[PDB]
């Protein structure tokens, strides 16, 4: 039976530590030096405990629901509190736990990613009902459907670290959430932790530390420079110059951006998917007319990126290249279809969400 | 012979940078924003001095009288300036050499607790004399004893990354030392740094990417989210709502819990031990009446993590197992006097230290 | 044929983001705290825009020039955006991606030594050019030469992680630059992620995780502690007491000394290496009579520790020993020689790029 291979455990769980590195304080100090100052303290400890349910929550049936087996939607609940997974218990090329562990730490960005946002508008305990009902109902079946055996990888879709799982899922909760900068060096500070923590997020999400990682990475590398270049590039063109909120926005564009894409794609793929993200991220803020600008970046650039993977796969392109029998026509029009399931699955269990707490306790901080 | 696997050599060096990262700036931040503002500076500098004098008297003598080996308490001076290790030489399934360096940086850390709070207070010459006292006399003796093959690892002492070593032990020298917050942000930065470089204190502590090493992982996770709701619950019960502070100090608090018991626990017991840990260290602090409150937390919890390692080892529990022969009965007497004898070895050299530096330059800084 | 080690392919792809983070946000926090607050932010676009330019650069044609194989001086346009490269392809014992990577990030740190310097006074337009010049002409032929097979290796230059390639380089970019502290929380921030960041630094330039790495890592701990104790003795010998800048600046010193060193010689080595270069760093800057007093650290640091990795690496005194036929008089002779080239070429070729900059957009900030 399936050996665990120790260069594979330490990259893992390496990778697992710099996604985690990405909340805890990447996305608390992006927000932080975004958000007014007197809501600065609030929301880091709003951050804070959230990350800590999440984390909670994953181990005690997160986890079971998301990766067990199951339907194309939700998996089992036989793995509550990790029982039933021997300690010793292999997954691909490494120890499940660590696999537990790399999985629960997306869990943790995508739900940083909005709690950072809502914090100064919503109610403490409104929030943590928020949490529980969207990682529950959204979070965990679209990872079920992604990367859990589910509906969408059964059809095919390619999405290496998550365009749709992470960005797109958070982009729209946040949007939903909307529709119900005092300190630079800080926001410069977290874009950057967000930036290396990235690699873990982006390469170790080949599971393995081989030439698929080493793709990964090199895309990162490229698709964020591109996506800085291309956003500079376009805020010179209609404010005359760049900025430091456009520079950490454009990398962050060409972040989000690869993200479906890096495992698939060649560096050529990665520089044209980082110039149009950086681009495309500029125009989304800009159409955008708040923190809440951020799901304009998170969103747009996640939906260029799930369909520019589509494009950029292909061999012709410089991609590994499609799965046999499949077409780029074919494999676009499945991205499309992830991306459509996503935002409307994402949005519904978020209004959900609101609509409960604001039920319960309010929404609206007192 | 033995020889080194790549992958946990790999593995090993990562962790060791993970650790000093605690440090530098890990530790220095987390004190920077809880101290007064004019002393901030003055605090930095002393860690980063002392920082730098661990490290040399590590290489020096420190870790071959720590780790060579010699009697009960203590090594030998075989291993001056690292004399007689061969370049290629392995220990455990690593290189011998990654081994000084992943053991120096916990001597790091221990020391950076100490210094940091104390650095307002103490005279600059005065730290340095007591860094050298106490590392030599209780950091170097302690460290034999528990991972050196010493008297408590030769009574069975259940301690996997050092809840005796490095917690007890720095919180007793600060504890007898304070006998003798203006930027939130900052320790909020601080904090994260800290967890995040914690996954190379505890993890690293396996010696190898094994599935000790992924339980460990994953028990910190778990141990510290469990810690941080802990806390903000019993905040909110006793002060009407949480604070960042409290968040940051729960994250501590099952941090240090889990320590000693990381590798030997299952993820059930390390909710648990997150729980009361969290509980405990408010409890600490409340009681403790400062950032002198910091070794409130430390000791606090590094006595409850250090019980409950006692406990939750049990197979029945969750956990790897107590040793042959062992029961839970006779492993919970052993952790008390693993705890007994940590207290008084430290207290005593703390008080020799702090003595001796105040009879040849003055403990009160002019 | 070459087969990748997993192992060694973690540990690089992990030590690419430990070097990125040196710049990302390392450099940029340690110049920050240092410039005047009005300047800042500028800066950090600077700062950030010219590192995305040198990640593009890099892949287009940069690593092409500087590792294919072509003469003394530079190499080739066969690798012009990776084409060719396969992408199982084998470099050493990890995957050639991951090598282009790791070099990439050392380009990376290289400008944004000098970018963080100049940003102040210089023109946005005019610092694109300059980098554009300098890079392909300056960085990419002396990477070359020492590392792409070029005149300097073919001749036995030692220099184990870039003394000559990046320091040197640098520094005297950096003063023909200079030639034509608001936040010490700050600055110390970005000292301390430069530490940490320089293990990969140092420690990945083994391209493995084997003994010399270990190696690497463990001498690069002892010169940092060497030389934050031999500067901030310096310091109290000279101005009647330390300080945090001293402190930090003592840190750089050592680890820009120990580059390129720390894979040759003994830890005995190591801590002389430290020492000398703790105390030449106070001279330099001392004699230096402006942030543009960091080329002084990284210059007279880069000097002294390339001439002192062609004594210490004597097998007499702990290293791993000159070449078969080499003597200590013949391999300082090619250390000086090495040293030589890189001033003048790097000078010159500095001196070409500001120029044209200046003629084409003008240099002096508008």
Same mark, same amino acid.
């Given at each position: 039976?399936?050996?665990?291979?120790?260069?594979?455990?330490?990259?893992?769980?390496?990778?697992?530590?710099?996604?985690?590195?990405?909340?805890?304080?990447?996305?608390?100090?992006?927000?932080?030096?975004?958000?007014?100052?007197?809501?600065?303290?609030?929301?880091?400890?709003? +951050?804070? +405990?959230? *990350?800590?349910?999440?984390?909670?929550?994953?181990?005690?049936?997160?986890?079971?629901?998301? *990766?067990?087996?199951?339907?194309?939607?939700?998996?089992?609940?036989?793995?509550?509190?990790?029982?039933?997974?021997?300690?010793?218990?292999?997954?691909?090329?490494?120890?499940?736990?660590?696999?537990?562990?790399?999985?629960?730490?997306?869990?943790?960005?995508?739900?940083?990613?909005?709690?950072?946002?809502?914090?100064?508008?919503?109610? *403490?305990?409104?929030?943590?009902?928020?949490v529980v009902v969207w990682l529950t109902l959204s979070y965990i079946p679209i990872a079920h459907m992604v990367w859990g055996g589910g509906l969408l990888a059964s059809h095919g879709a390619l999405d290496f670290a998550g365009g749709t799982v992470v960005h797109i899922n958070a982009a729209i909760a946040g949007l939903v959430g909307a529709y119900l900068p005092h300190n630079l060096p800080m926001v410069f500070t977290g874009t950057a932790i967000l930036y290396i923590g990235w690699?873990?997020?982006?390469?170790?999400?080949?599971?393995?530390?081989?030439?698929?990682?080493?793709?990964?990475?090199?895309?990162?590398?490229?698709?964020?420079?591109?996506?800085?270049?291309?956003? $500079?590039?376009?805020?010179?063109?209609?404010?005359?110059? &760049?900025?430091?909120?456009?520079?950490?926005?454009?990398? $962050?564009?060409?972040?989000?951006?690869?993200? &479906?894409?890096?495992?698939?794609?060649?560096?050529?793929?990665?520089?044209?998917?980082?110039?149009?993200?950086?681009?495309?991220?500029?125009?989304?803020?800009?159409?955008?007319?708040?923190?809440?600008?951020?799901? !304009?970046?998170?969103?747009?650039? !996640?939906?260029?990126?799930?369909?520019?993977? !589509?494009?950029?796969?292909?061999?012709?392109?410089?991609?590994?290249?499609?799965?046999?029998?499949?077409?780029?026509?074919?494999?676009?029009?499945?991205?499309?279809?992830?991306?459509?399931?996503?935002?409307?699955?994402?949005?519904?269990?978020?209004?959900?969400?609101?609509?409960?707490?604001?039920?319960?306790?309010?929404?609206?901080? &007192?």
């Amino acid at each position: 039976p399936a050996v665990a291979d120790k260069a594979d455990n330490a990259f893992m769980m390496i990778c697992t530590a710099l996604v985690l590195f990405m909340t805890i304080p990447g996305i608390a100090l992006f927000y932080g030096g975004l958000i007014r100052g007197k809501n600065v303290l609030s929301m880091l400890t709003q +951050v804070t +405990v959230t *990350f800590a349910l999440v984390c909670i929550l994953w181990v005690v049936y997160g986890y079971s629901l998301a *990766f067990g087996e199951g339907n194309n939607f939700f998996g089992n609940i036989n793995w509550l509190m990790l029982k039933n997974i021997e300690l010793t218990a292999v997954m691909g090329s490494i120890y499940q736990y660590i696999h537990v562990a790399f999985q629960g730490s997306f869990a943790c960005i995508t739900v940083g990613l909005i709690v950072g946002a809502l914090a100064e508008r919503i109610r *403490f305990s409104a929030v943590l009902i928020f949490v529980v009902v969207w990682l529950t109902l959204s979070y965990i079946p679209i990872a079920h459907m992604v990367w859990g055996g589910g509906l969408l990888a059964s059809h095919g879709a390619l999405d290496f670290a998550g365009g749709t799982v992470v960005h797109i899922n958070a982009a729209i909760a946040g949007l939903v959430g909307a529709y119900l900068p005092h300190n630079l060096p800080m926001v410069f500070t977290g874009t950057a932790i967000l930036y290396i923590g990235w690699f873990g997020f982006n390469a170790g999400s080949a599971g393995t530390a081989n030439e698929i990682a080493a793709l990964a990475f090199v895309n990162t590398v490229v698709a964020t420079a591109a996506a800085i270049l291309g956003w $500079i590039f376009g805020e010179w063109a209609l404010r005359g110059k &760049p900025s430091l909120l456009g520079a950490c926005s454009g990398a $962050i564009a060409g972040l989000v951006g690869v993200t &479906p894409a890096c495992g698939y794609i060649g560096v050529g793929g990665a520089l044209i998917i980082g110039v149009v993200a950086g681009l495309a991220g500029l125009w989304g803020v800009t159409m955008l007319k708040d923190p809440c600008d951020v799901f !304009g970046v998170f969103g747009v650039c !996640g939906i260029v990126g799930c369909i520019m993977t !589509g494009i950029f796969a292909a061999s012709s392109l410089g991609g590994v290249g499609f799965a046999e029998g499949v077409t780029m026509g074919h494999q676009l029009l499945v991205q499309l279809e992830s991306i459509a399931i996503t935002i409307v699955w994402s949005g519904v269990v978020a209004f959900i969400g609101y609509k409960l707490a604001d039920l319960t306790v309010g929404l609206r901080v &007192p």
